[PDB]
Amino acid sequence: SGISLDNSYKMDYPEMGLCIIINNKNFHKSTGMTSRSGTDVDAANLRETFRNLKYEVRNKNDLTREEIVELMRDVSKEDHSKRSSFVCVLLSHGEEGIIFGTNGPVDLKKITNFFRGDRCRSLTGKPKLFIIQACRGTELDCGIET
Amino acid sequence: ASGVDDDMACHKIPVEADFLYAYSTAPGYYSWRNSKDGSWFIQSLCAMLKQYADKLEFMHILTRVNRKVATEFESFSFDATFHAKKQIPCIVSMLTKELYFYH
Amino acid sequence: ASGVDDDMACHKIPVEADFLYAYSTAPGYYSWRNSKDGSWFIQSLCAMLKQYADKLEFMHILTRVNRKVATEFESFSFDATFHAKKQIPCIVSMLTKELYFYH
């Protein structure tokens, strides 16, 4: 055939892939975390947006730290051979490198490690996207007039 | 030329390659959410994907999201400490190719 | 629609906006340098800029750099601990527009 460049990911597999949305709105009283009013609007918007991009959207609400880890592990263990990519959206409280389960924090690295090129072979060479809506600290940007 | 660290017989890629982290805010910063309309970042991300997913490469879409959040949003708070604040999303790419949602 | 956090009378942008950090390696990882040829990252960055600066948007150039470093390099060390290792650069963008070095 003619010249082939391979500058863009192959996105014409039978399936675009999964879009896992973890929507944590209500937290255990014991954690002292406030309810995240408005996150349902985000979750719904994401489901519709990725639905139109042809992703298999799966939503999960108010997951504990253990449930988040179990979900990620289970998902990473699926056969993604016929999927072009993988998308995970995290909506919750957080700090630098951390996302909160309803009962406590979870290291983002623990979540993403399940999808490492050597641990999820059916996703090796495919784009793995993690969209994170959560704080990364306590600094505030005063901004500047333009 | 020749060296000890290039052109390996068996091709390998980093286990950390092909990941893209679309953070809602810069490292060390709070992230803003409207209790009624949703977070500034997700609101914007969905709006840009809806309008450009069939027209632009992913990094360019995320750049539009950065501009939308940066220019169109500013916090309102009865607490002076949290009032009139801004936010800039943070694109972290370990991708090795361009990404188009269409083909 | 109307809200408390949009369409401000006085336009402002985040003080952290318009920054781009082109890291040679992923967060928490060592970065490799050939004592003779230079670092894998800089070697690659210069090669891609020389070849694509007058043809591609900056993020796309950096993506080619990611691919070059990820695929073409692998460490060689007499110490088993540091032998046969890989590296993936890390693009961190807080930019609000596309960047072309030419016009």
Partner: peptide
């Protein structure tokens, strides 16, 4: 507005 609230922070995450």
């Amino acid at each position: 507005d609230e922070v995450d």
